[PDB]
Design a binder for this molecule. Sequence first.
Ligand SMILES: O=C(O)CCCc1ccc(N(CCCl)CCCl)cc1
Ligand SMILES: [Cl-]
Lengths: 209, 209
Amino acid sequence: PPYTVVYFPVRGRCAALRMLLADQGQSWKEEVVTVETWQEGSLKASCLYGQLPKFQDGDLTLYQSNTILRHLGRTLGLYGKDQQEAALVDMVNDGVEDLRCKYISLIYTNYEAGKDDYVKALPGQLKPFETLLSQNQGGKTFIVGDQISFADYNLLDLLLIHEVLAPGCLDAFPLLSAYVGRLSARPKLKAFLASPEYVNLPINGNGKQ
Amino acid sequence: PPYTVVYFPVRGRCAALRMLLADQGQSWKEEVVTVETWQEGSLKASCLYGQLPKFQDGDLTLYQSNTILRHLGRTLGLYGKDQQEAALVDMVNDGVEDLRCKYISLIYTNYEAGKDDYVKALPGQLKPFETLLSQNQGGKTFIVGDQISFADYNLLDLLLIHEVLAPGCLDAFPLLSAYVGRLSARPKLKAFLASPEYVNLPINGNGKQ
Ligand SMILES: O=C(O)CCCc1ccc(N(CCCl)CCCl)cc1
Ligand SMILES: [Cl-]
């Protein structure tokens, strides 16, 4: 395949780009990195910012999950119909990234002490996405415009992982709820989400979710 | 088109997009938001993620500093010559954002206890940008390709505030040192960087730097 994903055996920051590739019917290869290979040090030292994912599209080598999402969005026509929609797509993705960083901090950094406070604050963090939906054709299509964008896949992932963290958190958000059901039912996406290559990976690297 | 930036009287997350506008010969309006006005609550409630900057470009309203940078980059032709360069631009900008996040956490959250460890870890955080410069026409031009991008303005800001935090932090990095000097000397940028509207604003909102 022309695309290669180099990552740990986890969903994590590669979940959204994999859904994207799967739902767009694109071929890719997974190169899996074990704790042992990572602790050896040489791969890590070769990575631009000492981190995975690493991504290859022929001889173009990329780092940073949002860089990969933008690159696939650009090349696969999932980045708005014009320059205005492209900006709105970015605004969504930035908000998605912001909550993801808070999620990651909780998971890896203080799950036991921090979880109750995090869940109390969750609805205030989810509301901007409901608002965005309410303002785009009554929330019945995508997060921006009338075609799917890389931000939809990233937002969808963020909502799925939060329903695992806080079951029922979308009960307060009818548009986000319907949106999850709707995108998850796209046939290629539905098949990928049900498959062992997705189901048999943990969400995170430390066994918390 | 016309442009408006709504923000606190600080450089912070608006410094890079202001440098972009100035260097590109663009005109803009500053709407300054005081501590008192922000604490009142109504502006904040009206902001998509309850954060500034808020940006207006004619009828288009944007939030999130990197969304504003990409929008200005897209519409003004500061986003690489092709898809490969656009992707590398994003990769640089995401890396700048990551280190910016750490800087902000230090400044607002942990300045006294945390600064020594932060400064000790700094060279390893700067090395990737030196490397990227080394791989692009010997570091003689821009961070990506041979035309300026929005990532150059963001990286330049990151470098300037870090020289304030850790004087001499670029001395081991010849390409970065020369890049800062060279970009800073661009006539419109030089003029803006010397102006009271930049010089007389603090870097951050809490008086630390
Ligand atoms: O944008 C960034 O860099 C992140 C920090 C943004 C920020 C800047 C200033 C203030 N205040 C000063 C108002 Cl004059 C409130 C006191 Cl801290 C609050 C937040
Ligand atoms: Cl992750």
